[PDB]
Amino acid sequence: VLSEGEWQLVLHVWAKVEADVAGHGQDILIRLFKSHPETLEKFDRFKHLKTEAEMKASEDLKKAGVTVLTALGAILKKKGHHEAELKPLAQSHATKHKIPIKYLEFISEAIIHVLHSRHPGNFGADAQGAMNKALELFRKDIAAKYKELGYQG
């Protein structure tokens, strides 16, 4: 369980993501795909992209990033009270997309990596720790819902 002070560190760096969610989503998805190329395979619409330049130029990739980060932002703003938001997400990701927990770990790593690069002003050590706690809570609660849904994840 996060403290309120921990949540405020998370929310202060999220406010900067929100200056330009599309740009942040491009950087985060591209880092994911570069670090763990197998994750790209899950995205049928743009799994054929070969290079970072292609990825940067992809409107479909850009929209996915916006979708992902906006949904994450809504979860973070709940400050752990995210049961409603996680239901549909867990169901789709378990049953339609088939996203394992290890791939959620990989995107969490990409989010931290990009925030650390972009936002040294709001992503020092305490803030990074708070964001890791928030992302760990997200993954723990999604993993519990995957189990309810029948998915080993």
The region of 14-22, 42-50, 113-121, 144-152 touching ligand HEM under the rule CB under 6 A is: 42-50
The region of 3-11, 48-56, 85-93, 145-153 touching ligand HEM under the rule CB under 6 A is: 85-93
Minimum CB–partner distance for residue 100 and ligand HEM (Å)? 8
Among 103, 123, 146, 151, binds ligand HEM (CB under 6 A): 103
Pair of tokens at residue 148: 């309810």
Q: Most distant CA pair in the chain: distance in Å?
A: 42
**Cα–Cα distance, 46 to 62 (Å, whole number):** 11
Minimum CB–partner distance for residue 5 and ligand HEM (Å)? 23
**Positions of E strands within the chain:** none
Provide DSSP, 20-60.
SHHHHHHHHHHHHHHH-GGGGGG-TTTTT--SHHHHHT-HH
Binding mask 45-74 vs ligand HEM (x if CB under 6 A, - otherwise)? x------------------x--xx--xx--
Q: Are 49 and 55 in contact (CB under 8 A)?
A: yes
Binding mask 1-40 vs ligand HEM (x if CB under 6 A, - otherwise)? --------------------------------------x-
Kindly tell me which of 11 and 71 has the beta carbon lying closer to ligand HEM.
Answer: 71
- Any idea of the CA torsion for 24, 137, 45, 32, to the nearest 10 degrees? 50
